[PDB]
Design an enzyme around this catalytic site. Sequence first.
Site, short mmCIF file in Angstrom:
data_model
loop_
_atom_site.label_atom_id
_atom_site.label_comp_id
_atom_site.label_asym_id
_atom_site.label_seq_id
_atom_site.Cartn_x
_atom_site.Cartn_y
_atom_site.Cartn_z
N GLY A 1 62.59 105.53 65.00
CA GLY A 1 62.91 106.63 65.50
C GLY A 1 64.10 106.76 64.64
O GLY A 1 64.91 106.82 63.74
N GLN A 2 65.05 107.03 65.84
CA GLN A 2 66.69 108.09 65.57
C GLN A 2 67.45 106.35 65.00
O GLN A 2 68.49 106.27 65.51
CB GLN A 2 67.19 108.62 65.98
CG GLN A 2 66.21 109.75 66.64
CD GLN A 2 65.51 110.11 67.93
OE1 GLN A 2 65.22 108.82 68.65
NE2 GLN A 2 65.89 111.24 69.01
#
Length: 161
Positions: free
Chosen positions: A54-55
């Site tokens: 993800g991030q």
Amino acid sequence: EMRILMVGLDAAGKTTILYKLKLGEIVTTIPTIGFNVETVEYKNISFTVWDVGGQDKIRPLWRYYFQNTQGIIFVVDSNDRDRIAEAREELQQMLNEDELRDALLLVFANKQDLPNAMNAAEITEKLGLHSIRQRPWYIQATCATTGDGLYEGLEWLSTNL
Ligand SMILES: Nc1nc2c(ncn2[C@@H]2O[C@H](COP(=O)(O)OP(=O)(O)O)[C@@H](O)[C@H]2O)c(=O)[nH]1
């Protein structure tokens, strides 16, 4: 003394695996916002767990929590075909961290109880494990909820360490 780093996408089963080992309490720390670390301390071994994918929040600081890692455990949800490509990319970044270049790699192809789960052979090809050079690796098909397969995979990691 020595650290085992167990990482993978969220919901892969890592917290389930820590609890099945019965090697000590699971302790959660939040060293900074967006970075939850789960830690089990058994004798000289520290099991260190957090979610990748993800991030990749607070990624540049992961080196200061990587240190003294002698083995990596990569846990993947074998039924999560939607995110298998993301798990591959996240594994490759771990395989390129300078502090982890000598660490052994155990891959848990988890959730083999699910009917549409990819098998360990398929997971091996999807992760690109055979492209790994000069680093010993091993993959085990597991069900963390039953514990099936965890001993055989950790047997390889322990005997090779
Ligand atoms: N069917 C199945 N579910 C699992 C398995 N391992 C973990 N889970 C489930 O997946 C969910 C997330 O597990 P968790 O350990 O918190 O994953 P983590 O976020 O990587 O730590 C939980 O509801 C677990 O019960 C497995 O081998 N089979």
